[PDB]
Subunit: 337 residues, 4 copies
């Protein structure tokens, strides 16, 4: 039984101790402290060596990812890529601290586009009429110039020409994850999440990849050079076997929607994830999947009954960088060792 | 300039009158009244003369709304061809079908997932779904999938979500099914990530006993975008957020914005989510015409929607017949 | 075990059946159906005759309110008076369907002011700069002209002169509830909630009555005619004995904040309310009192352990008129009988 | 024009640097960065030369924040005279005192109130408070109340909330108490409805063994309004909504608006609540000067506040000493 005590600034600004203090501060501050421990538990377990029996089992996948004592699924809604959390995510992927990525259309395309042009800060109140008249798109309190997508078009189109050909002439069978790997190879920029992703053999799943600017481009291009096909069935198999053949699994889910359900549902195939941390703003009263508490996932069997999941009700733009600072970033060496 | 005034229950209770008073009650009560006007404006426009209509209506809803009784409310609109395009996520598709094989029950939000699981019960909000529901679903679905694979290989069928949804509705062949009616009235259903739910599970398993099935999401994009592009007028009625919302609005962007738009979701904007984005943000992208007067009602659709329908579509059932 | 089934509009628009359908529709629709039953349970119990033993006990209060088999507490946040819910509340009070009212400063003053000038509809997006330049105040998507308060000033001031005198010369010991009764007598308008309230001997409590335009007026007036005193201690006793000496008690709480806690806390004095229905938009993650679920109140003893409380997560402007339509308004006769 | 860019953990971990990156991370991360600037602008202004200051800071918080560890964070600011006026509800006052007699524990939100009650434990969010805590509180409080009544009758003391709060802090006489420090540094505390919580319970009971106590809320209004009226500059830092928020802002309206304003609450506007109102609505009433650049962070203060303080007030501890 721990007592509620907040950080005493009479000790001065000791950032490390200040963050540790959140766990005994209460409300969401405490959930954060719990989130930190749960994520570390995943990390600790992942860094465990793979005994013969577990290594054998984990090795039952075609993937080239070095089996780990714990497979970590990282999911985030598109807008989090629009935000600076893109850098926070790029880092983890860069150093192989996570094994599978799941994000919606926006979450993929905007990572690339940021390699051709930046997103600007703005305000939530800016009116859509004047904005449009100036060729500016609004994403929360962020701003994206139309030119950003034009550039995106110039860069993408030829790649799509390559993919359609490779499809018909070399018989490739495209899927979201495969295309995402390809695009990241193509972007060839170290500031790109997906560039790293493919380099480190970390699969990215996005069932509705057509729901975005990337979908726009594919749509248009499909007229001058028809044929492209994106099968979502193969990718389901792919992402499900990732959960099925894992020694342990951790889910780190930022936001809700498809990203959240797709990751957890994959973990149901192995009868529950071992660790789970949620950081979303959704509430449960609307009966949405997004807002469901981690305990609801327990009923379905997406989170083992003996697991100790945590949900932090907050905007990830604020919490995540912090979570990372106290977990993965602290084991920087181990992930390079 | 309208004054604030709520319904005076001294008149006794006239439900039609009470619903009308919302408009001047304020806060979300007002937005509801505004929503009613917009939905009617769509309707009026759709009913204009000179099978395409004077206004193409896109109806979108999150899966959970199909888990709820709103399944009936949506089934009705589809049943009488009051809407043109349906957009819903995987759960929203499969659960309509499952409800024709077994019911979903009421429950509580507080029920613990441990005991629930031990009793073979899944929780969807304050609703409950027995594992046996999905077993039945599998029994029903498996053989249809076999044919689909067959037809794909021997008959050259290039499956996509909408196509599969049409097939399954035809297959469920039950008047209580939204998708049964959808295919009958040639109302297309779009679900990019159809593989995100039990239907995906089934497709997954089945792919090992009979491999091969392919669901293309490219064709469907063209399909849904052309739906918006060649339309005289368009109205968007979006319950919930996520893919359902963005997908429908992004399609209208191809026509340079929708003519009418009504949203009913619980999302807020501060998180910078697309779900919580106000209709005015969509205007900046060009998904909602600058001259349009969109409306968002911050509320649970399980409450608002049946009411919205009662004061709009249900009031014109004769015109739709 | 009831099955989930929504209203089938193929039966046509039968409003009465449509609303009954909410209970089996799920999510908040169901909570509404439950709210309707809980409120009716209060009503049914209130309309029960008072046996000798219960009548004796209930009669142990100085109040002139005809003891009922169930004392109903109605609470609402100020903004709900600004809205049309003012009419919905005025109705219940008008016909004695509730026994105690609890509302914040705004909730009192705006009821009177609406008797001198109306509140207009507006938009949430209207900028505060241009609004102020035109002497318009914003309350949500509602609008209130400065003139509204000027009028309020002219009407009020002399009454305050009367109260200060009556305080010093006739020894009155003013408190919020007493002043609220007085103001309602003074407003003398049947469209006024508080006019009816005092007429029907229904006490209104508002501990922080000074938190509003009424507080502004009192502040100013206190300079030309100093002395006025508002004791909140007497009112505490008053509102607590209302709960203590009740045969049964029902809480109907719209919104949160003081209104919610003050009513429930009073019910703790009798070791729990018998029925309770909440309609607020608050969530619990912030550890606020507003957002606490009714079950938390059970831990303190504000809601009997055997009660079956209900909370509807929604804007009261939408739900309340409906709740009323299916409960109190249905027993219109009984309350006049 | 600033580009969006989040912290690059490749630099390793520099907490001060990481907090700085929030400003350009976006969504609420940005608002936090904006809040930091505003709080500092207040500070800078307050520290200007030529006991009144070049800027009067009003600090407001909902009771529950005193239940949480934020009690320490607030105690600190009050301890070093970094703020001028405190405004908090009844719970926010009594629980600070109770924490000097017994601690509040961590718990869970899901714990059922039935079992909890059977074990003499009260729930405050995911926190827990034992009934014995309040028994101790009663023991401590009763005799002080006796004196207060006495002094009121024999010495003509006209009690009000602020006055009682000063007295009780003096009385708790413990350095860990916010209110102990408040009275020592002559920092007034306002709580119009002080009778809304255990302190009210105690006052209630005690009034039967020793009747008479009167708490006037009129004097306190004048007191708090004059605080804003005669101020060179004013800054509002409001954690939460309800009375705390409105009361502080309404007081600044008497001076025709506050110079700086930073809000940290979880409330949204759609309900038309005063709590959820954006800072721009306060501008229409004249509570926030038209030229001011207010900031609201949509978040739980238990997370944001300690951080905000670390980057503002804590950075100037030398200036405040
Ligand atoms: N970035 C964009 O805004 C954008 C851009 C292009 C396309 N899209 C398309 O929009 C579709 C829907 O977007 P989505 O499903 O990825 O997300 P979303 O915006 O629909 O959000 C889903 C839920 O995640 C939670 N959430 C969102 N932002 C959060 C935050 N900052 N912190 C915590 N929780 C948060 C909320 O509870 C929200 O209801 C995508 O599938 C994509 O195709 C997104
Ligand atoms: N019904 C289910 O829970 C279920 C079942 C099977 C599969 N799925 C899968 O879960 C994925 C994510 O679900 P989703 O994107 O359809 O929705 P969601 O549950 O993620 O909700 C998205 C947003 O819509 C709003 N919303 C949801 N319910 C609402 C309501 N009743 N009233 C008002 N607004 C509401 C909320 O702001 C929410 O954040 C789906 O793509 C699907 O494949 C859902
Ligand atoms: N009407 C006004 O806006 C106004 C006017 C003058 C003075 N005031 C002053 O402001 C102070 C604070 O106001 P308050 O405590 O009465 O309320 P509030 O605005 O602080 O709301 C408190 C909580 O009630 C809930 N709520 C509010 N509106 C709701 C709705 N429509 N439906 C459901 N739940 C709702 C929300 O969860 C909110 O957080 C009052 O004490 C009063 O003195 C109010
Ligand atoms: N701590 C307690 O729970 C408690 C204890 C005893 C008495 N009380 C009584 O309850 C009454 C109502 O409480 P209140 O008006 O102080 O607050 P509240 O709990 O009613 O909250 C009002 C609003 O402030 C915001 N908020 C609350 N907690 C927040 C957080 N951690 N971060 C961000 N924003 C937050 C929310 O939007 C909320 O709707 C008080 O007047 C008091 O007399 C409180
Ligand atoms: N194959 C398992 C799918 C489980 C779906 C669970 C859906 C839960 N939905 C809400 N909580 N809204
Ligand atoms: N093809 C255009 C897609 C535009 C996507 C815009 C997304 C906005 N997202 C927010 N979170 N506001
Ligand atoms: N005299 C009993 C007072 C009980 C106060 C309970 C406060 C609960 N607070 C939150 N849930 N935030
Ligand atoms: N003395 C001026 C008081 C102004 C009160 C305004 C309240 C606004 N309330 C909202 N819910 N917006």
């Amino acid at each position: 039984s721990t007592q509620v005590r907040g950080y005493d600034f009479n000790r001065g600004v000791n950032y490390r101790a200040l963050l540790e203090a959140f766990g005994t501060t209460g409300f969401q501050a405490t959930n954060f402290g719990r989130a930190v421990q749960q994520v570390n538990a995943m990390i600790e377990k992942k860094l465990e060596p793979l005994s013969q029996d577990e290594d054998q089992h984990a090795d039952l996948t075609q993937s080239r990812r070095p089996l780990t004592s714990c497979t970590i699924f990282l999911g985030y809604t598109s807008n989090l890529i629009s935000s600076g959390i893109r850098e926070t995510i790029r880092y983890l992927v860069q150093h192989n601290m996570v094994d599978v990525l799941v994000t919606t259309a926006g979450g993929v395309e905007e990572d690339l586009i940021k390699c051709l042009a930046p997103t600007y800060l703005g305000e939530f109140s800016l009116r859509g009429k004047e904005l449009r008249e100036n060729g500016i798109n609004r994403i929360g309190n962020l701003l994206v110039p139309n030119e950003n997508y034009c550039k995106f078009e110039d860069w993408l189109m030829p790649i799509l020409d390559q993919m359609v050909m490779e499809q018909n002439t070399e018989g490739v069978k495209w899927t979201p994850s495969k295309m995402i790997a390809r695009l990241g190879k193509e972007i060839n920029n170290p500031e790109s999440v997906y560039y790293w992703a493919q380099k480190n053999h970390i699969p990215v799943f996005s069932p509705a990849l057509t729901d975005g600017s990337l979908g726009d481009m594919i749509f248009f291009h499909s007229y001058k050079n028809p044929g492209l096909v994106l099968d979502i069935v193969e990718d389901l198999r792919l992402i499900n076997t990732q959960a099925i053949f894992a020694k342990c699994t951790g889910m780190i889910i930022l936001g809700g929607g498809v990203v959240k359900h797709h990751i957890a549902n994959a973990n149901l195939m192995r009868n529950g994830a071992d660790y789970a941390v949620y950081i979303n703003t959704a509430q449960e009263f609307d009966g949405s999947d997004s807002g469901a508490r981690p305990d609801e996932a327990v009923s379905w069997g997406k989170i083992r009954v003996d697991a100790q999941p945590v949900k932090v009700y907050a905007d990830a733009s604020l919490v995540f960088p912090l979570l990372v600072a106290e977990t993965f970033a602290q084991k920087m060496d181990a992930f390079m060792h």
